[PDB]
Amino acid sequence: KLRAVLEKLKLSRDDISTAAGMVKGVVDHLLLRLKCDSAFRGVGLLNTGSYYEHVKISAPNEFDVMFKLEVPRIQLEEYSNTRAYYFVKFKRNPKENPLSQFLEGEILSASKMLSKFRKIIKEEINDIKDTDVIMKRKRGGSPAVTLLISEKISVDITLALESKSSWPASTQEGLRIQNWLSAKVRKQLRLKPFYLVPKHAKEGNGFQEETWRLSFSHIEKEILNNHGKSKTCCENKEEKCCRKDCLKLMKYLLEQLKERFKDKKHLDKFSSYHVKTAFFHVCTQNPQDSQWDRKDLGLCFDNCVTYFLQCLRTEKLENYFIPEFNLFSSNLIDKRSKEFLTKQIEYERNNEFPVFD
Amino acid sequence: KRPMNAFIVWSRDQRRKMALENPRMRNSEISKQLGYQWKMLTEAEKWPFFQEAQKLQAMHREKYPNY
DNA sequence: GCATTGTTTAGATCCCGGATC
DNA sequence: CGATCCGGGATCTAAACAATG
Ligand SMILES: [Zn+2]
What we know:
2 copies of one chain form a homodimer. By secondary structure, the first copy, chain A, is an alpha+beta fold. The first copy, chain A, is built from 8 helices and 9 strands. In chain A, helix 5 packs antiparallel against helix 6, helix 5 crosses helix 7 and helix 7 runs antiparallel to helix 8. The first copy, chain A, is globular. Chain B binds a DNA duplex through helix 1 and helix 2. Chain B: This is Sex-determining region Y protein. Chain B: Belongs to the SRY family.
């Protein structure tokens, strides 16, 4: 049915090859010139985003590169009772932690360190002349350094802090993937470190910006690349799952819609994370490979719409890793945009999503 | 039914007009002789059969969207 | 159902970027 | 390092399919 729509979404093999070539050439040199005893000496590369998760659509012009810092012995103080934003404190005084120059009092400067980070990058992108490079202005709020290579190929770089300590109290009931995947897998997955990225946008007065956001992008990559209740789902032609195909078309649905409303109107200001988080809860309640048969492509899609419709209809989508945190909270999005969104899809669903062609 | 390629359009008449004159009951031998004969015709002797096969798929490809 | 020739596709091989240790 | 091996766009090889007693 809609199986042909995927052909209009497959990335050209030569496009990804040339794009990732120039992206890697800038990233490695930027990473090489980084880590010169600015306490960045142990920065590592973490590949996340819709590309490395094999769900990138249209043309490969955007990348999500993450830089990590293995900063040890960090004590985190929960900001208010948000359950997601955190103060970075330090557990003990003696060791002289590498980011101590970025310590304000007992809290870490999410602004001074991030500006220093952009400073080192802006200094060295000019020096290299192998590739035309323009640094996009830091977008109001945006914690990322958006580089623009010649002729698109934008690169989003988010400085992150790696924490090998155990996860937090907020994530205690999250990641409810026990019938799906394994309870053994959850333990194996929880031991992996959690990451800290500066808060993306203004909230509250706009000050006290030293809050940090939890990030489990590496977690989302692992379970996507090993997604089957049986270990060999997608290993062989038999029992190929449609999981990736569902939120692929879902991302194309919303991507298609945002472009459609180019009037600077509503249905704006929410990204694929809501689609990905919704598809995540879909696979939770559907923890069997039989439910995700390839033949029932329109059925599993319809079930994923149904849960997204219901997530819209219920006006609550909690973060997968953080249950209390609601991505469809009344503060985040007005109920009218859900009315806006549900109006479209229901029309598009019965009338076979006419925006595809 | 997939349209008749130029060989089948040419093979339907020749097998008949051979099995009448020939006394071979088996079609295995007769088909071997037809492939022998088709492999020995000039390209001009085979062009109208290509034109016919093109007209066959002309009203089977744009009237039946299945292949 | 045998044996031919041409067309069409799907079942399979190849090839490369990413990734983990 | 790099050695290896997997996932998926690209491309090939193969068998099945047509008329016929
Ligand atoms: Zn699968």
